Amino acid sequence: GSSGSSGMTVEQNVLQQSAAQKHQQTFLNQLREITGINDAQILQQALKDSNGNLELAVAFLTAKNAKTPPQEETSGPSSG
């Protein structure tokens, strides 16, 4: 079981590393915010291509759905 062993230690995190990296769900969710995409058919597609590389999943996504250039048209900018 779990039990009340150990008192606040950093011995139950170092594991997360990698172990987490290997999690499709975690990936999609990752590319979900990164690119902000929601569709899974798009998130997965990126992953599939990347072959398991977020950077590639983002690059592929980024090199597909980006903001339009400073052309003559409406849009509506934003700032703080």
From Swiss-Prot:
PTM description: Acetylated.
Induction field: Induced by type I interferons (IFNA and IFNB1) produced in response to lipopolysaccharide (LPS) and viral infection (HIV-1 and SeV viruses) (at protein level).
Compartments in which it is found: Cytoplasm; Nucleus
Function: Deubiquitinating enzyme that hydrolyzes ubiquitin moieties conjugated to substrates and thus, functions in various biological processes including inflammation, immune response. Modulates the Wnt/beta-catenin pathway by deubiquitinating and stabilizing tankyrases TNKS1 and TNKS2. Regulates KEAP1-NRF2 axis in the defense against oxidative assaults by deubiquitinating KEAP1 and protecting it from degradation leading to degradation of the NRF2 transcription factor that is responsible for mounting an anti-oxidation gene expression program.
Family indicated by similarity: Belongs to the peptidase C19 family.
Name of this chain's protein: Ubiquitin carboxyl-terminal hydrolase 25
Ranges for domain UBA-like: 21-64
Top-level taxon of the source organism: Eukaryota
Gene inactivation effect: USP25-deficient mice are more susceptible to various viral infections including H5N1 or HHV-1 compared with the wild-type mice. In addition, loss of USP25 protects the liver from oxidative stress-induced injury. Knockout mice have increased seizure susceptibility.
Tissue distribution: Highly expressed in testis especially in primary and secondary spematocytes and in immature spermatids. Also found in skeletal muscle, liver and heart. Expressed in the brain, with high levels in the cerebral cortex.
Subunit structure: Homotetramer, inhibited form. Homodimer, active form. Interacts with ACTA1 (via its C-terminus); the interaction occurs for all isoforms but is strongest for isoform USP25m in muscle differentiating cells. Interacts (isoform USP25m only) with MYBPC1; the interaction prevents proteasomal degradation of MYBPC1. Interacts (isoform USP25m only) with FLNC (via filament repeats 17-18, 20-21 and 24). Interacts with GAPDH. Interacts with SUMO3; the interaction sumoylates efficiently USP25. Interacts with SUMO2; the interaction sumoylates efficiently USP25.
Organism: Mus musculus
